[PDB]
Amino acid sequence: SSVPPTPEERHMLLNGDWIRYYHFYPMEGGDSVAVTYHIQPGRTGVTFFNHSFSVHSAVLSVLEHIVYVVDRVDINDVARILSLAQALNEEKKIYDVLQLVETHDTHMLKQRRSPGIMSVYCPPQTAFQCNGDPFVFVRWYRFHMENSMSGFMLSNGAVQVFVGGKYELRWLDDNRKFIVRSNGVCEVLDEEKFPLSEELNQMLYG
DSSP: OOOOOOHHHHHHHHHSSOOSEEEEEOOOOSSOOEEEEEOSTTEEEEEEOOTTSSOOEEEEETTTTEEEEEEEOOOOOEEEEEEHHHHHHHOHHHHHHHHHHHHHHHHHHTTTSOSSEEOSOOOOOOOSOOTTOOOOOEEEEEEETTTTEEEEEETTSOEEEEETTTEEEEESSTTSOEEEOTTSOEEEOOTTTOTTHHHHHHHHOO
16 A cells, blocks of 8 residues: 555644534425535534525624625635625525524534534534634535445535544545544555445546
């Protein structure tokens, strides 16, 4: 196999902007029409599954009093930064979902329950708020049921795959994929001998 993870690579795979937890919208209601997630402090995002819908993603920062709205990722990323009053008076449907999910997540944490499907590795976060920091959202989501893989491609180019609960795959450069474990061990995925390679390649390029 190849060279193990460099100290800079291990710092990126464990302290970069990654999904700390994710779940779906609706939470009863009908089937799923969006995936909700938490990447940055104070920010709860949602990414809509339906291609007919004009809003691709929206991120809610209650403390920053803003809603970051992505309308198209077809490229270029057509995005807006609306205030909480502008979101309520223009994109009410999206604002209601964003607020329903923020209320669900904070209620789960105030109860000691897991707010969603937890990441295998979540770090002691300085958290607080992301004042100033740019916005990281989910560009695409994919699920393969035979393996229980849940792959996400983040707006910053990073890919994060949740393989069941067993482990995760995280990477920035496509030809240097890593395997992150619950204990913070990062290893280089040798895609030549990896058994879910065909299943992963269909998810990325399909």
